[PDB]
Structure formats: structure tokens, C-alpha cells
Paper text:
Cyclodipeptide synthases (CDPSs) use aminoacylated tRNA (aa-tRNA) substrates to form peptide bonds between two amino acids yielding a cyclic dipeptide product (CDP). ParaCDPS from Parabacteroides sp. 20_3 (GenBank: EFK64745.1) produces cyclo(His-Phe)8 whilst ParcuCDPS from Parcubacteria bacterium RAAC4_OD1_1 (GenBank: ETB63777.1) can synthesise both cyclo(His-Glu) and cyclo(His-Pro)9. ParcuCDPS belongs to the XYP sub-group of the CDPS family, characterised by the presence of 3 residues: X40 where X is a non-conserved residue, Y202, and P203 (numbering respective to AlbC). ParcuCDPS displays a Rossman-fold common throughout the CDPS family.
Inspired by HisRS and histidine recognition more generally, and by the only high resolution structure of a CDPS with a ligand bound, we systematically altered three unique residues in ParcuCDPS P1, which we hypothesised to be participating in crucial interactions with the polar side chain of histidine. We first designed Generation 1 containing seven P1 mutants (Y55F; Y55V; E174A; E174H; E174L; Y189F and Y189L), and these variants were cloned, expressed in E.coli, purified and used for activity assays. From these calculations, P1 is predicted to be mostly neutral apart from Tyr55 and Glu174 which form a negatively charged microenvironment, while P2 is predicted to be mostly lined by positively charged residues. By mutating the P1 residues, the activity of the variants was vastly reduced with E174A and E174H incapable of tolerating histidine as a substrate. E174A removed the hydrogen bonding network thought to be essential for steering histidine into the pocket whilst E174H was designed to reverse the charge of the residue and was predicted to repel the incoming histidine from P1. Further investigation into the changes imposed by these mutants was performed by solving the crystal structures of a select few mutants containing changes to the active site or the pocket residues. The mutant structures were able to be solved using WT as a model and retained an equivalent fold to ParcuCDPS (Supplementary Notes 4 and 7 relating to Supplementary Figs. 13 and 14). Therefore, the disruption of activity is caused exclusively by the change in these few residues which appear important for the enzyme to produce a CDP.
Author numbering: 1 to 4, 11 to 60, 70 to 230
Write the structure that this text describes.
């Protein structure tokens, strides 16, 4: 379980663990290993949050937090309190969607929402994103559901792109087991190589660092 870079063993960064809820790789055991890896390599804190989710709330991410995320976090906490010492447990921050989606963050989401409504090339590219995901599944989805899912990605996009605070604590880097179409998309966005208007408006030359960590 190692990094797939000298600043990492110089422990320059706090590390987030970006959990994909319902993704088969994110067993409790694989989460515990990412948390162990992060505690060893982090500057100080490890931030655990739900990074995506592929009506009790107008915000999809918030609905995921209240319906499933809490019970996920309860299981992670019990596992950690058996696997790690009290002083290591003190370094872990369980960041709900509310701890992340502060004022500044919601302005970034609203910029993306309005771009998704007023720019058809952006809507279409985000929608084509969803279609390739669910082309991999047996289940089928209409165009209205596809357009709904596209909005849901946008809610999580700033957290992948910009360095943000979880309950007062900046984390510059996050770990994820493999490159995805999303992490490739974010990489182009941060460079201004795709939809340059987004970098100009919502990003700021401290880019969120993606660390690929797996067995």
C-alpha cells in the first residue's frame, strides 16, 4: 500500500481520504488502509469525507450524508478506535458535507451550476460524462436522470479541484486508489486546458494534489 513525490515523505501536506460511497473498492478494510497510509505520510491531520456518490434535501451530497454517510462514519470510527492509538485517532477529522460546503465553497458550486445551465457545450460534456459511467452498468437511465446526475458531479467538483478547509483545517492533498475519468478531467481543468473559464473564475493557483495510493 504505497504511493504510485519527495514532499510526501517530507510530510508537507495534510491528506484527505476521498471515499466513493458504494464503490466496491471502498470496503471498510480498504478505507482503514488508506487511513493508515495517510496518518503516516501527513503533515498533521487526516480528513475523511465522502467525495462522490455514484427527497430530504435540496442538495444531493447532503442527502447522501444524512442517509448513508453517517452510518459509514460510525463504522469507520469503531474500526479506527480498535486499530489505532488514542494519539493517532486525535489526528483524524470526519468531515461531513456540511463541514466542507461552507460559504466560499457554495459560491464555487453555484458558478458551475450556472455554467451547466447557460453553456450547452459544458452541459453536454458533463452529460456525456455520466453516460459513459452508466454504459458500464447493466442498469439504464433516461435523459432527465442523466441530467440530474450531471448536476451532482458539479457539487463535488470544487473539492477535487481547489484546496478547501474541513472544519477550519486546510488539506492540500487527497488519496484515491486509481486514476479515473474525473481525476483526468480535473487535471485538465486545473491547467486551463479544458473549459478555461472555470480556472479563471473558481480556481486560484493552489491546486488540489491527487495522490494515487493502492496495493
Amino acid at each position: 500500500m504505497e504511493l504510485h513525490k519527495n514532499d510526501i515523505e517530507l510530510k508537507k501536506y495534510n491528506i484527505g481520504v476521498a471515499i466513493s460511497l458504494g464503490n466496491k473498492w471502498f470496503s471498510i478494510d480498504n478505507i482503514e488502509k488508506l487511513v493508515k497510509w495517510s496518518l503516516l505520510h501527513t503533515k498533521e491531520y487526516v480528513i475523511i469525507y465522502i467525495a462522490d456518490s455514484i427527497k430530504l434535501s435540496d442538495s444531493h451530497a447532503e442527502e447522501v450524508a444524512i442517509r448513508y454517510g453517517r452510518n459509514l462514519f460510525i463504522k469507520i470510527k469503531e474500526r479506527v478506535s480498535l486499530s489505532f492509538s488514542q494519539d493517532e485517532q486525535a489526528k483524524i477529522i470526519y468531515a461531513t458535507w456540511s463541514d466542507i460546503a461552507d460559504s466560499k465553497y457554495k459560491e464555487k458550486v453555484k458558478y458551475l451550476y450556472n455554467l451547466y445551465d447557460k453553456n450547452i457545450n459544458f452541459k453536454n460534456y458533463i452529460e456525456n460524462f455520466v453516460k459513459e459511467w452508466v454504459s458500464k452498468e447493466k442498469r439504464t437511465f433516461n435523459n432527465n436522470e442523466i441530467n440530474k446526475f450531471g448536476r451532482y458531479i458539479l457539487e463535488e467538483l470544487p473539492a477535487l479541484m481547489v484546496q478547501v478547509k474541513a472544519r477550519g483545517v486546510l488539506f492540500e492533498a487527497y488519496v484515491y486508489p486509481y486514476k479515473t475519468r474525473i481525476t483526468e478531467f480535473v487535471g485538465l481543468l486545473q491547467k486551463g486546458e479544458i473549459f478555461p473559464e472555470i480556472k479563471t473564475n473558481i480556481l486560484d493557483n493552489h491546486p488540489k494534489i491527487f495522490l494515487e495510493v493502492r496495493e
